[PDB]
Every structure is written in C-alpha cells, then in structure tokens.
Amino acid sequence: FEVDPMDEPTLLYVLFEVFDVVRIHQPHRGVIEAVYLRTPFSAGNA
Amino acid sequence: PAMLAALQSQPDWAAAMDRILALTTRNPEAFRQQPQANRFSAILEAVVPSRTNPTHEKVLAIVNALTESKAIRKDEAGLIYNALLERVARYNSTNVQANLDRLTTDVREAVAQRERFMHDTNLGSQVALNAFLSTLPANVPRGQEDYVSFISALRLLVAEVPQSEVYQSGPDYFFQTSRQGLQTVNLTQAFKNLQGMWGVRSLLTPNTRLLLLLIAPFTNSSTISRDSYLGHLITLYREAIGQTQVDEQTFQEITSVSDTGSLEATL
C-alpha cells in the first residue's frame, strides 16, 4: 500500500472481509445458544 | 401423528450416498456439477456421518398426538412441549430416551382402538345404550314381548349409524341423538310410555312418535303383526319414509325442470 504525503497521521483502514455468521438456536424456552464463526480470522465456534 | 412430526422437522444418508456416488436414475449428472464447495460438504457426510439428537423430534411426535386426541388444547402446545422437553431433558438417559421411543412408535400404531371408537361408536352409543337397557324395567313386560324386537332394533340403529348417534345420560333420563347437529333429540327415558302399548290392537306423545320415526327404517317384519299401534305405526312410518324418498326425488326433478309450487302438490 502506497499513499501520498499528508501531514496528519492517517491510518489505513483495510477491511479484510470474510464470512461472519451467528446461528442462535433456542432449545428449552429460556435459553438461547449462540455459535458464531468468522473465516479469515476465526472465532467462537462457540 | 408422527410423519406430522416428521413433516414438521427433520428437513437421510442413503439418499445422499446415492446421489454423490451418482447412483440415482433421473439425473445422475447432478452432484458432479455443483460448486466444488458443496461437493466437499456432502462427501464428508456419507464418509463419516454426523450424529443427531432425536429427543425434540419424537417429543414433538408425542405432543402432536395428545392435541389430536384431545388433551393439551391446540393453543397450549407451547407450554406442554417445553415442559415435556425439560422433564425429558432432566431425567434423560437411555432410560427415558428410549421409553419415549416406544411411546411414540406405539401411540401412532395403537390408534386402532381409537378408530374402533369411531367405527362402532363403542364410546357413547353401545356402552351407554347397553347401560340404559340395564335401567329399563325387567325384560318381561306384561302385554307382549314384541318389546325385545324393538329394543334390539334400537341397538342395531345405534350400531349401524356411526354418524354421531350419541347416547347422553343428561341426568336421570338417557336421551338419543340422531346426529351431532342434534335436531331430533328424543328422550329415551320418556318411552316408559311405550311400556303401555307394548301389546295392544293418541296416547303417544310425539317424543315416542319421534323414536318410532327414528328407528322405523331399521324394522322389517320384526315388531310385528297387528300388534296394535306399535305394529302398524312402525309399518306406516316406514311407508311414509318410502313415500318421502319418492317425493324428495320428485321435488328435485320438478325444481330442476324449472315459489311454493311443488311443495303444494307433494305435501
């Protein structure tokens, strides 16, 4: 990445995208269980 | 009451390894063409199948049974279902998780009695009548014993008209319905006014007349002879039923040809 000179520190803001689902389930009335994922960085297959 | 649980949940493996392997009939060239993402998300299934958790399903296979016979009302199978799940989600074990299985694969099969319940009305027609016939006087009326033929025609009527023919015991007096509509409710403890004419040759309140007209079709040479009144009337009621059939077809014909009209020179 190559940008021209400004005089105020700027911050590049790349957004490496990627799938980001969450699949709430709801079994017994009263519980919600969530199980996320993010696939180019990874998270709670919880 | 199960496939209604199958057709309310559970979106096979033979059908999956029959398609990836390309062993189907219609379009074998089906799974090959999908994106190479799907073909690597359906091959690792019929190579190492993933387990399941069937509780919910067959529990939903029990609720759909209760609410179709009549316990838990239609609008309460959201409390009943949670309660059953949580009970079976506590004490669960190969103990219960099986005791269900039997219940769910028996309640849908032990439905024959229920079918019988509605095929001889042996719920409120014969159990009630064969109770009411036990509240009748002794089975030896004074005048005649055409009694038994009549009282048997009653049982035949109740057994061969499943429509509803319910026999309530609406307090001290058991009353015969002719249909769930109930527009011929005749009182069956009020034909202890036929333990009069059971044997003779204007004292019949139509209620008795209603019973006679109700059963008559199912009487042949039974109530018989010139056993007075009770005899003829039954025969005359049958004659009137035949004439009523005749007039019914006649009136439909005469109103299909074309206002009171037919109603006058028919009745």
TrEMBL record, chain B:
<comment type="similarity">
    <text>Belongs to the adenoviridae hexon-linking protein IIIa family.</text>
</comment>
<feature type="modified residue" description="Phosphothreonine; by host">
    <location>
        <position position="250"/>
    </location>
</feature>
<protein>
    <recommendedName>
        <fullName>Pre-hexon-linking protein IIIa</fullName>
    </recommendedName>
</protein>
<comment type="subunit">
    <text>Interacts with hexon proteins; this interaction tethers the peripentonal hexons to hexons situated in the facet. Interacts with the penton protein (via N-terminus). Interacts with packaging protein 3; this interaction is required to promote correct genome packaging.</text>
</comment>
<feature type="region of interest" description="Peripentonal hexon-tethering domain">
    <location>
        <begin position="1"/>
        <end position="92"/>
    </location>
</feature>
<feature type="region of interest" description="Binding to hexon-linking protein">
    <location>
        <begin position="124"/>
        <end position="227"/>
    </location>
</feature>
<comment type="function">
    <text>Structural component of the virion that acts as a cement protein on the capsid exterior which mediates the interactions between the hexons, including the peripentonal hexons, and reaches all the way to the penton vertices. Two hexon linking proteins IIIa, one from each facet, stabilize the unique edge interface between a pair of facets. As the virus enters the host cell, hexon linking proteins IIIa are shed concomitant with virion acidification in the endosome.</text>
</comment>
